[PDB]
Design a protein around this ligand. Sequence first.
Ligand code: SAH
Lengths: 44, 251, 39, 117
Amino acid sequence: RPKRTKASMSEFLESEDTYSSGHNRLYFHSDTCLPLRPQEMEVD
Amino acid sequence: HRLWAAHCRKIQLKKDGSSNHVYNYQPCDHPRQPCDSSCPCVIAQNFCEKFCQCSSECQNRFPGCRCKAQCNTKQCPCYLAVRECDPDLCLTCGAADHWDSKNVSCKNCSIQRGSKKHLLLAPSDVAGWGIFIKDPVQKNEFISEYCGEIISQDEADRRGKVYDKYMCSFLFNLNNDFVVDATRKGNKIRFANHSVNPNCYAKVMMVNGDHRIGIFAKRAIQTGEELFFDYRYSQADALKYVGIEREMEIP
Amino acid sequence: NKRRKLKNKRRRSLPRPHDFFDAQTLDAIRHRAICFNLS
Amino acid sequence: QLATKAARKSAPATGGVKKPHRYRPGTVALREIRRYQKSTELLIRKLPFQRLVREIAQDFKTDLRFQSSAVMALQEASEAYLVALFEDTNLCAIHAKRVTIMPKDIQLARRIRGERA
Ligand SMILES: Nc1ncnc2c1ncn2[C@@H]1O[C@H](CSCC[C@H](N)C(=O)O)[C@@H](O)[C@H]1O
């Protein structure tokens, strides 16, 4: 939800003074470090 | 079986009170003597195993695994026992029931077949390579054992200083007498990383007289999660070795 | 999660995720704008 | 030698056996009550009761012989008498807001009945 608070410069002043799911990152066949393909990501 | 627990009071009131002195199993074999005070396992402070030659009358034999719901949770004293629920004993939890099959109510039945998960290989968020889980799992559930070579303290101490010079540790403290090496040979979990508050933790195992070490889930896990555990080093070591913690300042 | 903070609740420092952008792009762009600027 | 020791990963060494396991006070008592209230067997061993009655009767006359049926007549009569005494004695103990009985309850129990005082 958008916060849409006010515009006071104290917003940044006090500040200075991502709902991932699934299998996001790339993977690897854990036998030779070869890049892993989703086609076989189970039987492997 | 309460007299074995009464023996266990003697077992605890003199030798097991430290609860850290753990030693390699040995066959307490008594050519003529009974299972005396100088019994090899007694001085080792453990059961007369069935592989030993303390005969069936021996009260230091572990009674049995009689958990009729399942050997997997607090009231199961075999679950409190460091050991996988013996197939010969937990007829109450399907320990030997369909040892070829993969479905049973008990959970302390992993190493006996190898109910392994499907790992992942990739770089990690925290440091270098990493290991990840494929499918959701629940808290207090098995994760594949930390398999590895078994070596002695001194060689590892000889290796560790060299290992630490390159900052290497494929070593888990096995017991007061030995240590598991995972440098060249190793499991699939060997390439995971560390958290102070990870989703999973390691539990010390006694797999049929073998000191072993698996992993169990601290919290809920769904798909695509990292896999960490507390390496439990010194604080100076931890900053030296595992300093990265992956968190910011909320308050 | 109700107590979710801003889109920065990750860490203080972590390994480099690598920069996919390239350098041969840069210099090629450099003369491209050079021949673009003069015209 | 082992001047220094390497740093290794570690987990709790905890490996201890089951706690003690003992029925609570009072519980087994109620077990006893069912077992015996749902029962009939005379509760004094015969030889100790035989030796008691023979010696006490020898005060009044010597050379007494007893029909074996006559002795158990004393036993069954006495056990009925005490059990009757103990039930009413408990009532007085319950009256005093006391779970257990005390010796002073019986003299009250016998006195109210009237044969003693
Ligand atoms: N959370 C952490 N922060 C910084 N270093 C860590 C760490 N967890 C493990 N390490 C270091 O990594 C070593 C384990 S080998 C793992 C290296 C790296 N994580 C990779 O997978 O490529 C240990 O010696 C330890 O010093």
